Amino acid sequence: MIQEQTMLNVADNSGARRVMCIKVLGGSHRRYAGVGDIIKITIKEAIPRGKVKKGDVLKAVVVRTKKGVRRPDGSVIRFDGNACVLLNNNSEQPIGTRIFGPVTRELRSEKFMKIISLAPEVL
Amino acid sequence: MIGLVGKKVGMTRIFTEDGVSIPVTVIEVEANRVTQVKDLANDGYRAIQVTTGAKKANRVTKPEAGHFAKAGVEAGRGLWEFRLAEGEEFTVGQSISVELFADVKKVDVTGTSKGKGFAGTVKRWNFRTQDATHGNSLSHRVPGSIGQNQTPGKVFKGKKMAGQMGNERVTVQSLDVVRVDAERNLLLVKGAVPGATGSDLIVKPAVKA
Amino acid sequence: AVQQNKPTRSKRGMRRSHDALTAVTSLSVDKTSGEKHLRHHITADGYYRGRKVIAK
Amino acid sequence: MRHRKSGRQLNRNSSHRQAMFRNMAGSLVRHEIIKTTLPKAKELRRVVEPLITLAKTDSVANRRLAFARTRDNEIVAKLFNELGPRFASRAGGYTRILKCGFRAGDNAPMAYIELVDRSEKAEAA
Amino acid sequence: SNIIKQLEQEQMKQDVPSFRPGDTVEVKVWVVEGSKKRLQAFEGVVIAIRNRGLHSAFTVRKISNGEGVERVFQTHSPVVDSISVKRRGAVRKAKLYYLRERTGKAARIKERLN
RNA sequence: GAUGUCGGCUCAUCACAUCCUGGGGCUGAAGUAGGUCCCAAGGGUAUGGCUGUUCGCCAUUUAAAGUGGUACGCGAGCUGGGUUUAGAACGUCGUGAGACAGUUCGGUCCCUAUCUGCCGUGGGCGCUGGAGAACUGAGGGGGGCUGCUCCUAGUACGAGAGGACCGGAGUGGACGCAUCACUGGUGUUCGGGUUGUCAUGCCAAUGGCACUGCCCGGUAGCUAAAUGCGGAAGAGAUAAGUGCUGAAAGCAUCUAAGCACGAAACUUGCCCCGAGAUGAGUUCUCCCUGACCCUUUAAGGGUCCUGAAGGAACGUUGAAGACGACGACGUUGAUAGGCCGGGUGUGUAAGCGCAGCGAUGCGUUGAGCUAACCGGUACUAAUGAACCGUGAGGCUUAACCU
RNA sequence: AAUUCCUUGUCGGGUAAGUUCCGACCUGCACGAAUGGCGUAAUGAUGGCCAGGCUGUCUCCACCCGAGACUCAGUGAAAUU
RNA sequence: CACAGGUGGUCAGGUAGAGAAUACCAAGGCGCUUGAGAGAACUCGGGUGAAGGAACUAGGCAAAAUGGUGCCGUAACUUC
RNA sequence: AGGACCGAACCGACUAAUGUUGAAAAAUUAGCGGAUGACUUGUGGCUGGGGGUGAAAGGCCAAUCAAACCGGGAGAUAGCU
């Protein structure tokens, strides 16, 4: 449950450390982005020699949230923080080559197959 | 197709073999007894009037009692009508069970919604509250403007204002029929239906796809 | 906010058309003491449904 | 809304209500009959009747629990020594409300609330 | 309520082992891993238990790649294949929410040896 | 002898010169995507950075971010940042008091709603004897949005790049209603921990006060962030438009006669109200079967006797409620409280015993306590009774029957 | 610029985006030396701007506790007309 | 006005505390001269709040937050 | 030592909400500044209306001060309503 101004951690090796949600994509007046949703982000903090820089405006897929995901039996999987994976603005494909921390099977799509394969754990 | 009268028992869930939890409303559908058959010749329209449940003899008035006596049925908690289709035919004193819904895929469920009493514009009409701070004076959940000026010089009919919320006839459409069991007097529908536990429900096959 | 026009004695009476009191119609007599009383209430001498329930 | 809720607020806060019913439960145990408003007599049953139920089993723990709810050892002594045995075989309903007048000063509906098998000797002394 | 109770107990698991808050539990869950259907283990501390007949649940907390993961299991769900206590934990509270503010050495729970 | 100014907030309502979605003609329209005009007002129609701003520029969205009217809509609805008071300063002008339609810092926003209007909710009487229900449906209101992916099909089209119509499937955004089973929030009425202090004689155990003293949890209910469902399809008549047959006018011509199509607008279809629909409708059932007197003699007035069905009253009350209303129950009784058993929540009470110098630990013990919950149970309270409402129901004509 | 009309001047910085802010330029409509000029540590319920923490300020409002509002009894106003 | 306003001096118990702050009490004085119910909107005054965390607004207005003692340690600049 | 620091009494009055036919003709509540000094306060005294007093706001001079209040000239005058 991510909105504009939300700060997220980064679940990849793009070089980004802290990103802010500047837009929840996918609809007019669309309020929140959850696990699996694409967001528009600004880089607030980045490592000295990464794939991205502080101030860069791009996209990201949300992979972990404090609100978590519901499963068809009524179950919930929640995370201690909100994390995202940086995506190229046009291709909407990952910038990084490695994924950190667990991800959920909700990413099982043709476009986020790379994220589930790279992830250490899939819940 | 005709519908039946029931009672909202409450909600539970049905767990499936593929790990799905279906939220269900338990509806008690006891036999519905035909108290009157309305035809074109006598009434100008075709329908069945039904009763269900039981009523204390000391609460059944003489006018009520005579109407049940004519049908040859015991007194029920009330009377409800269902319009007949062409080809649909019933008889006075006939019993209709929940099995009517056996091969009915979706139903429309009517109930009297829970009463919220006198409700403000925020609860009743989802009006947005004004500032909690920033100098607001006595005007947080208050409705704001209710009109324009000298043109039109009046508030319009239908203006969203505070008033009685709930405790009214509400129909929830196209609910999936999960289970029918005449032996247990049961109908399980997927999702929530209007009303409180113990209140009467009208169940009819879905009017839409 | 205040009236622009003085309301009438007619109007006053119309407003008051629901103000009349209702006389109690629910008085019973105790079978033992013979005292009048409000239904479901004890009598002045402390009788209720023919029995002396309060010694006052 | 107030849907399925129990307990009268009585234009008081929580700690005042509790203090008052602790006093009023003591008054009824002591005198065996009291005159109060109809809503207060109705609320009182919910405080005094579980006290008599507790007094049906004499133990140090039950006496201490009754003391925590009454803070009067004369009241806990009468509960366990007199009322507990007197009501031993009665399954609830140890009290009775008898509706009476209207209070002169404010037109409040009054009621008498008494212990079902009243001792006129204990009431006088 | 009697009708609901009857509909509920016929769906209730009979073999639920006894576990309590602070215990380390391993839940074996049915998952669809692409085109495959296998059992997946989720081991961690029971931080909450909701005892509610058919609506019973339990919250299991684990540390994955330095960050906390909480899973709320619906006890009577066919998705939950088995539950086994791996370690008995000694705690005073029903709800171990204070463990969310604890990391590594501070989040350790003593073993219940009785 | 006062009609409060800009902008914002809240709440809107109309127009159409239409922003999107829908239909269509022309295109310098291959496709995709556009341009322009016609038809169309059903719904839908961003959040931010800067500034008092409206606007505007900029960032990032969106199917789209419409243009206008409504006292440049809306202060007896809110704000008070801009802007006309009094303080003060700078630049400029003036000898000066002062001045600026220059800038700058600071700077009191009242009104308990009588009438109209509107949102809710009652009381009265009427509908022609009275009464209890179930309805018919005139009329009124609500709703009406849309993305993306997939299949058709890498097809038609195209040198390629790219890439459809028609039709079908799925899944979302926003909006709306309902519900509390799940996930949670709350839960000063449940359980526990703890600080300071005062009391219950003291120990131990408890209680008061300090924001519920401060906290950790949490039942029922309420509830959204939770999870169900909805917008439709279809039908009728159309708009712009496309046509068939066809004269006037030997031909031609969608039109004059005749005929076929055609849109999110319109009428239906869906949801809610609804016979005060005084044009007061229909159906089923229930109840009432005594005399007398008087006058201006008539649909007249009154008296005695009668008092039904039903309604109400009183009481116990409700997931019903401001009050009223509405629903359940009243001993031939589960309506409320209590009581019993369970569940739930808290998390192993007290007392005693053991271990330790002690704090404290261990055992008895998942203990004790447990609201609004579930299943039961007449222990308490729901009294035999009373009040309102009557006593066979107008005239005319017709049709049956006497 | 508490001074600059044109003006949101231009350039740089900060922000995803900055009519304000900070640094710089000089084209000072209309700075300038006790009408004091330019600085200046400390001080300030002083004006402008940025950040961390924090949060119902807001997305967007939910539940709860109290005092009114509502009902009964007693007393009993007002402006206006 | 039996009015939440104003009015100079003196006295200074216990526990905790730096204290005449503050909390609980003693002596002593009081419950404030309409009450009874109910538990709607809305207003006032409070408590708790998922995910987010200034996106609010003219402006963080209001809230929330910080808060004690000891020791360690502490930058530019400075009139030292 | 200090118009030193933090902070009650005491003196003041920066912000907000409430109240605005008020509990109050300027307050209440939560916060705020000074708190050994150009401090604060009691009792009594002196200055008087074109006059006083003023760390200066045209502030204050007995609840409206760019000329107090009361009585008088007085029935000022009013080409105005």
Ligand SMILES: Nc1nc2[nH]cnc2c(=O)[nH]1
């Ligand atoms: N006591 C009593 N019981 C009833 N049951 C049905 N009506 C009544 C009534 O009026 N009184």
Ligand SMILES: [Mg+2]
């Ligand atoms: Mg009915």
Ligand SMILES: [Mg+2]
């Ligand atoms: Mg209700």
Ligand SMILES: [Mg+2]
């Ligand atoms: Mg808002």
Ligand SMILES: [Mg+2]
């Ligand atoms: Mg005000």
Ligand SMILES: [Mg+2]
């Ligand atoms: Mg307010």
Ligand SMILES: [Mg+2]
């Ligand atoms: Mg107005």
Ligand SMILES: [Mg+2]
């Ligand atoms: Mg008009």
Ligand SMILES: [Mg+2]
């Ligand atoms: Mg009161």
Ligand SMILES: [Mg+2]
């Ligand atoms: Mg207290």
Ligand SMILES: [Mg+2]
């Ligand atoms: Mg208690």
Ligand SMILES: [Mg+2]
């Ligand atoms: Mg006038």
Ligand SMILES: [Mg+2]
């Ligand atoms: Mg047009």
Ligand SMILES: [Mg+2]
């Ligand atoms: Mg043109």
Ligand SMILES: [Mg+2]
């Ligand atoms: Mg429109």
Ligand SMILES: [Mg+2]
């Ligand atoms: Mg566009």
